[PDB]
Design a protein around this motif. Sequence first.
Motif, PDB file in Angstrom:
ATOM      1  N   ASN A 105       0.987  12.691 -77.051  1.00  0.00           N
ATOM      2  CA  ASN A 105       1.550  12.979 -75.501  1.00  0.00           C
ATOM      3  C   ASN A 105       0.866  15.027 -76.089  1.00  0.00           C
ATOM      4  O   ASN A 105       1.299  14.914 -77.437  1.00  0.00           O
ATOM      5  N   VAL A 106      -0.080  15.095 -75.024  1.00  0.00           N
ATOM      6  CA  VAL A 106      -0.380  16.841 -75.009  1.00  0.00           C
ATOM      7  C   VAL A 106       0.229  17.404 -74.772  1.00  0.00           C
ATOM      8  O   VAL A 106       0.579  18.784 -74.592  1.00  0.00           O
TER       9      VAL A 106
ATOM     10  N   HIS B 236      -2.724  35.256 -73.159  1.00  0.00           N
ATOM     11  CA  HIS B 236      -1.842  35.529 -71.540  1.00  0.00           C
ATOM     12  C   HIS B 236      -2.207  34.609 -70.974  1.00  0.00           C
ATOM     13  O   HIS B 236      -2.878  35.283 -69.617  1.00  0.00           O
ATOM     14  N   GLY B 237      -2.301  33.484 -70.828  1.00  0.00           N
ATOM     15  CA  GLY B 237      -2.977  32.142 -69.303  1.00  0.00           C
ATOM     16  C   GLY B 237      -1.903  31.984 -68.272  1.00  0.00           C
ATOM     17  O   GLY B 237      -0.864  31.799 -68.935  1.00  0.00           O
ATOM     18  N   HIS B 238      -2.201  31.871 -67.190  1.00  0.00           N
ATOM     19  CA  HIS B 238      -1.737  31.806 -66.097  1.00  0.00           C
ATOM     20  C   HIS B 238      -1.523  30.398 -65.944  1.00  0.00           C
ATOM     21  O   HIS B 238      -0.376  29.796 -65.389  1.00  0.00           O
ATOM     22  N   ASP B 239      -1.801  29.578 -66.102  1.00  0.00           N
ATOM     23  CA  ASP B 239      -2.006  28.092 -67.037  1.00  0.00           C
ATOM     24  C   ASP B 239      -1.854  27.731 -67.710  1.00  0.00           C
ATOM     25  O   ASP B 239      -3.027  28.216 -68.213  1.00  0.00           O
ATOM     26  N   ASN B 240      -2.460  26.250 -67.870  1.00  0.00           N
ATOM     27  CA  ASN B 240      -2.413  25.361 -68.728  1.00  0.00           C
ATOM     28  C   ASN B 240      -4.400  25.508 -69.225  1.00  0.00           C
ATOM     29  O   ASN B 240      -5.043  25.634 -69.931  1.00  0.00           O
TER      30      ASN B 240
ATOM     31  N   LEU C   2      -5.525  21.317 -75.454  1.00  0.00           N
ATOM     32  CA  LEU C   2      -5.581  21.868 -74.183  1.00  0.00           C
ATOM     33  C   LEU C   2      -7.081  21.310 -73.609  1.00  0.00           C
ATOM     34  O   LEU C   2      -7.445  21.835 -72.550  1.00  0.00           O
ATOM     35  N   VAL C   3      -7.553  20.562 -74.278  1.00  0.00           N
ATOM     36  CA  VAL C   3      -9.114  20.160 -74.277  1.00  0.00           C
ATOM     37  C   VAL C   3      -8.008  18.266 -74.360  1.00  0.00           C
ATOM     38  O   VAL C   3      -9.263  17.527 -73.976  1.00  0.00           O
ATOM     39  N   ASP C   4      -6.778  18.197 -74.383  1.00  0.00           N
ATOM     40  CA  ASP C   4      -6.647  16.812 -74.230  1.00  0.00           C
ATOM     41  C   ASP C   4      -6.699  16.003 -74.988  1.00  0.00           C
ATOM     42  O   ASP C   4      -7.319  14.487 -75.357  1.00  0.00           O
TER      43      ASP C   4
ATOM     44  N   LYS D 115     -17.980  17.864 -82.251  1.00  0.00           N
ATOM     45  CA  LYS D 115     -17.822  17.429 -83.491  1.00  0.00           C
ATOM     46  C   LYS D 115     -16.975  16.077 -83.082  1.00  0.00           C
ATOM     47  O   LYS D 115     -16.687  15.083 -83.732  1.00  0.00           O
ATOM     48  N   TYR D 116     -15.694  15.943 -82.177  1.00  0.00           N
ATOM     49  CA  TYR D 116     -15.009  14.986 -82.073  1.00  0.00           C
ATOM     50  C   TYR D 116     -15.200  14.288 -80.940  1.00  0.00           C
ATOM     51  O   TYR D 116     -14.019  13.126 -80.256  1.00  0.00           O
ATOM     52  N   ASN D 117     -16.622  14.491 -80.357  1.00  0.00           N
ATOM     53  CA  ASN D 117     -16.612  13.365 -79.057  1.00  0.00           C
ATOM     54  C   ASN D 117     -16.161  14.024 -78.053  1.00  0.00           C
ATOM     55  O   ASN D 117     -15.407  12.782 -77.034  1.00  0.00           O
ATOM     56  N   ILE D 118     -15.415  14.543 -77.827  1.00  0.00           N
ATOM     57  CA  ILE D 118     -14.389  15.482 -76.518  1.00  0.00           C
ATOM     58  C   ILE D 118     -15.332  15.814 -75.267  1.00  0.00           C
ATOM     59  O   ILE D 118     -16.214  16.743 -75.515  1.00  0.00           O
ATOM     60  N   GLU D 119     -14.666  15.931 -74.254  1.00  0.00           N
ATOM     61  CA  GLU D 119     -15.887  16.263 -73.103  1.00  0.00           C
ATOM     62  C   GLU D 119     -14.234  16.843 -72.189  1.00  0.00           C
ATOM     63  O   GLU D 119     -13.193  16.586 -71.992  1.00  0.00           O
TER      64      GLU D 119
END
Length: 330
Positions: free
Chosen positions: A188-189, A233-237, A202-204, A259-263
């Motif tokens: 689970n992310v 310091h992010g406002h959200d994810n 953050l990129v799932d 590299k991990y073929n993530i979109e």
Amino acid sequence: SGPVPSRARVYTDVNTHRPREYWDYESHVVEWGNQDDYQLVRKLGRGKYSEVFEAINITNNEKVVVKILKPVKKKKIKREIKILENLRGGPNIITLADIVKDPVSRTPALVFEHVNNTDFKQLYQTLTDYDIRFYMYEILKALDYCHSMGIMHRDVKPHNVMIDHEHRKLRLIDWGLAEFYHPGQEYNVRVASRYFKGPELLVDYQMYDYSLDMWSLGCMLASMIFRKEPFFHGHDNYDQLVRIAKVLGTEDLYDYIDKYNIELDPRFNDILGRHSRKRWERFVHSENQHLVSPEALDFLDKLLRYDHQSRLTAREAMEHPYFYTVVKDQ
Ligand SMILES: Cc1cnc(Cl)c2c1[nH]c1c3ccc(O)cc3ccc12
């Protein structure tokens, strides 16, 4: 045709060589102690999953901490218990002293050894250069131990590191998000606290490992040496990843996801922008310079990598020149 799989580069197969019972927490049978041993004294805090109390073990008059649970995913109960039992006696791991049934909640209450903590918002303004190195090494002892036991913490942050500054003693707490690492498993992310979430979260990207904890530790280090709380310091994810990219740059982010073929979520199309990698000296000024060294920056740089596979492991981190000035006990 989806994402490329990943494996931890260390302790990859530790759980697969263990008997079912070590990691099959669902089948664990809880050993119950006697709730009448403990008297609640002071409420210390409430989370979404539990209430935490200072208490006294009335048998020995020793101070204690009681965490009274109540999840919706009730399997979390047995997972946290089994993990704490598996890790008991490890360096700088909080000790589970007992498990009792609370009469009011009618749920398990975890009883831990007491630690005389100082508030991190207060403590992180006092720490000398020497003290930062010392306490970092102590956290590393805890993380290498749990990683070696086939467990990732997944919620490393200052609130979860209890420090008795007077005795120079440290404990890693709150194992409620901790999980067993199995090669190839998707996780689970939605773990860790916002400012300490690794880019994999953050990129799932679900096939993550122990290295998540090393990103989180890097965030802590950056906040301490630069006197900037939090560092990212992010406002959200979503903004959280933008904040990271403003320091590490976008070209290395795209390199990671390619590299991990993530979109990326297309939500990023109009918020990510184009950012260069910054040199770490950017964050140095006259108020934090006494905490910064070439060793500090080099160590930090090797923790805060997008690619989870490229980060220092806990053991490699303890080998770093940053720790050469620290007296080791004993
Ligand atoms: C909010 C929270 C969640 N989970 C745990 Cl194990 C703890 C916690 N606070 C504490 C503690 C707070 C003070 C302390 O001396 C010892 C502790 C030991 C464990 C936990």
